[PDB]
Design a protein around this ligand. Structure first.
Ligand SMILES: *[C@@H]1O[C@H](CO[C@H]2O[C@@H](C)[C@@H](O)[C@@H](O)[C@@H]2O)[C@@H](O[C@@H]2O[C@H](CO)[C@@H](O)[C@H](O)[C@H]2NC(C)=O)[C@H](O)[C@H]1NC(C)=O
Ligand SMILES: *[C@@H]1O[C@H](CO[C@H]2O[C@@H](C)[C@@H](O)[C@@H](O)[C@@H]2O)[C@@H](O[C@@H]2O[C@H](CO)[C@@H](O)[C@H](O)[C@H]2NC(C)=O)[C@H](O)[C@H]1NC(C)=O
Ligand SMILES: *[C@@H]1O[C@H](CO[C@H]2O[C@@H](C)[C@@H](O)[C@@H](O)[C@@H]2O)[C@@H](O)[C@H](O)[C@H]1NC(C)=O
Ligand SMILES: *[C@@H]1O[C@H](CO)[C@@H](O)[C@H](O)[C@H]1NC(C)=O
Ligand SMILES: *[C@@H]1O[C@H](CO)[C@@H](O)[C@H](O)[C@H]1NC(C)=O
Ligand SMILES: *[C@@H]1O[C@H](CO)[C@@H](O)[C@H](O)[C@H]1NC(C)=O
Ligand SMILES: *[P@](=O)(OCC)N(CC)CC
Ligand SMILES: [Cl-]
Ligand SMILES: [Cl-]
Ligand SMILES: [Cl-]
Ligand SMILES: [Cl-]
Ligand SMILES: [Cl-]
Ligand code: NA
Length: 527
């Protein structure tokens, strides 16, 4: 029986057997007042004592959100869907700890992706018990509001100010500051880590003065706040808030009256209209995301980044070899997960239309010009490969590299990875390669479980990544120092060295996608 006293009450956890040892898991601790009724669309409110032993013995509700129904029955997509009840009452967090209780353990705090519209901490690929067992760190993860319920904005209006879900993440870091010593944690050694929209969220906590003192270091997997999908403009945000009002018949003249109307709507009506607050959309659409609210985010974040206005600390930033492929089967003509998807030039051009809505005709042509100068015109998989590269370079790889670069220019050590291993167990087709999302299970250590059908080379790759991630958290340096591993150099502007992660031999390379990112980064933002 393990009871820990928190500032708010006692919590009971549960014991788990992991690799012939024991981990204590406290799943589903509340960290804020449920954001129901009058609290819907407001910032999270702090929680008050219970007294009372809260049983933290199962995952809590995931936050309200639309689900992916493109491939029913398919594990590839469905493994990403929520696996606990959806509810507005979703402001909970999990803590895994080594057994025996550690003395002053480094803490890893996971923030999930999901386009800011979906996601939950209770996915099996986010389970923190292998890390706690193997590296003796504390792993913490939290649910935070997504979609309109998390990011609806009527700028400056405390009834609906924007960024509520970022504030939920933030109030969870506060909970770790106040409470993690009780569990054997070190509040002075906390590393935030996240993937996709979770990584962009980590990058914005680097920018937020309210977050500065709530953590030590940061890890960004496939995402940064300068990615083109990560920040909504004040103009867009309003248009979308009002379009939601119109679609739910909540149009008004008094903006606070609009919000009052939206709080009477049932969670489901709001969810069902979210998708149309926008005329055109893409498979990377973030209808309701971060905005500049003058609170969480004080200025346009590109300005903050450029001018050195962020937390000074080390970062670890990486991307996967084939970020863009997963998205091609959510609407690009000629694509399918059930065949090899050899598309034509005309289909490629149509695909650009899906992913670059408007986007001038000249813009789309320039993308076509940069990516289709074949060497050579023979290769039938040409146009199919070019479209995924277009998508992953624009949306993930080039913003990550540009982020790392601008961050490093202010003096801090930074380390960049390029993840090139495709899981032996991937249920997606071979042509999709090293997909977005599929480093996560390696970082969380799932392949350490032999019972599980990953190869030997995969167990070894994972064990090594886990060590580097843990050494980063504890010591600011992602080395694996014992097994003659390749040493991981800092990423500097000028050299831009990065480390490749794969089962065969890991290399030090330079200037990833140099020629492609010159296009996305200097030229395209003009069109
Ligand atoms: C701001 O919104 C307008 C339109 O407002 C929207 O109403 C919503 C209920 C939604 O269903 C959406 O379809 C509708 O657009 C956007 O302009 C729209 O673009 C096309 C033009 O062919 C029309 O179908 C819309 O009716 C038209 N506006 C209208 C109705 O006046 C506009 O793009 C958007 N501005 C942005 C992006 O900030
Ligand atoms: C790979 O499949 C795609 C996707 O669409 C198809 O999925 C297949 C597995 C099959 O069941 C098919 O009936 C299903 O619609 C194919 O794209 C389609 O190409 C067909 C050619 O008959 C067109 O009629 C469709 O409009 C087009 N689908 C769309 C709208 O995206 C694709 O041709 C196929 N390519 C191969 C075999 O290499
Ligand atoms: C726990 O250690 C505290 C200091 O933490 C520092 O050392 C490393 C953990 C590293 O991550 C640094 O960034 C931190 O500055 C110390 O002040 C506390 O008193 C310790 N608490 C205990 C042992 O109960
Ligand atoms: C919490 O769990 C304990 C131990 O299993 C149980 O005895 C106690 O009644 C529980 N409290 C509840 C069910 O609210
Ligand atoms: C709008 O209506 C709200 C509803 O209570 C009210 O509080 C507010 O004063 C009104 N705003 C103004 C000043 O127009
Ligand atoms: C070091 O290598 C041994 C085998 O020689 C292996 O079992 C262990 O997992 C390795 N440690 C790390 C952190 O990779
Ligand atoms: P991520 O948050 O993706 C989920 C892994 N990204 C694309 C989904 C934001 C648009
Ligand atoms: Cl899995
Ligand atoms: Cl060729
Ligand atoms: Cl190595
Ligand atoms: Cl390259
Ligand atoms: Cl160019
Ligand atoms: Na050009």
């Amino acid at each position: 029986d393990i009871i820990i006293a928190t500032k708010n009450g006692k919590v009971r956890g549960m014991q788990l057997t992991v690799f012939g040892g024991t981990v204590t898991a406290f799943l589903g601790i509340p960290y804020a007042q449920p954001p129901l009724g009058r609290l819907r669309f407001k910032k999270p409110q702090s929680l008050t004592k219970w007294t009372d032993i809260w049983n933290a013995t199962k995952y809590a509700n995931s936050c309200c959100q639309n689900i992916d129904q493109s491939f029913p029955g398919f594990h590839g997509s469905e493994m990403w869907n929520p696996n606990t009840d959806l509810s507005e009452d979703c402001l909970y967090l999990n803590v895994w700890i080594p057994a025996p209780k550690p003395k002053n353990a480094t803490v890893l705090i996971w923030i999930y992706g999901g386009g800011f519209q979906t996601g939950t901490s209770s996915l099996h690929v986010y389970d923190g018990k292998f890390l706690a067992r193997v590296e003796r760190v504390i792993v913490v993860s939290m649910n935070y509001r997504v979609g309109a319920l998390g990011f609806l904005a009527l700028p400056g209006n405390p009834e609906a100010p924007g960024n509520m879900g970022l504030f939920d993440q933030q109030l969870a870091l506060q909970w770790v500051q106040k409470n993690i010593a009780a569990f054997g944690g070190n509040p002075k050694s906390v590393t935030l880590f996240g993937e996709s929209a979770g990584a962009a969220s980590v990058s914005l906590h680097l920018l937020s003065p309210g977050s500065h003192s709530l953590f030590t270091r940061a890890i960004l997997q496939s995402g940064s706040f300068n990615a083109p999908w990560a920040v909504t403009s004040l103009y867009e945000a309003r248009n979308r808030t009002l379009n939601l009002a119109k679609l739910t018949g909540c149009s008004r003249e008094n903006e606070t009256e609009i919000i009052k109307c939206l709080r009477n709507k049932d969670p489901q009506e709001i969810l069902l209209n979210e998708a149309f607050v926008v005329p055109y959309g893409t498979p990377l659409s973030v209808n309701f995301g971060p905005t500049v609210d003058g609170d969480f985010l004080t200025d346009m974040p590109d300005i903050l980044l450029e001018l050195g206005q962020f937390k000074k600390t080390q970062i670890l930033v990486g991307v996967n070899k084939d970020e863009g492929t997963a998205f091609l089967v959510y609407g690009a003509p000629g694509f399918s997960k059930d065949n090899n998807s050899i598309i034509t030039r005309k289909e490629f051009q149509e695909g650009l239309k899906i992913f670059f809505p408007g986007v001038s005709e000249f813009g789309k042509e320039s993308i076509l010009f940069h990516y289709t100068d074949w060497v050579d015109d023979q290769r039938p998989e040409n146009y199919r490969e070019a479209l995924g590269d277009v998508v992953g370079d624009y949306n993930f790889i080039c913003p990550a590299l540009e982020f790392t670069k601008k961050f490093s220019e202010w003096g801090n050590n930074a380390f960049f990875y390029y993840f090139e291993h495709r899981s032996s167990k991937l249920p997606w087709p071979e042509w999709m390669g090293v997909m977005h999302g599929y480093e996560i299970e390696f970082v969380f250590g799932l392949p350490l479980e032999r019972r599980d059908q990953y190869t030997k080379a995969e167990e070894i790759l994972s064990r090594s990544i886990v060590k580097r991630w843990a050494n980063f958290a504890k010591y600011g340096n992602p080395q694996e120092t014992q097994n003659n591993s390749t040493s991981w150099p800092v990423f500097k502007s000028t050299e831009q060295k990065y480390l490749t992660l794969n089962t065969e031999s890991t290399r030090i390379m330079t200037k990833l996608r140099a020629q492609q990112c010159r296009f996305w980064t200097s030229f395209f933002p003009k069109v």
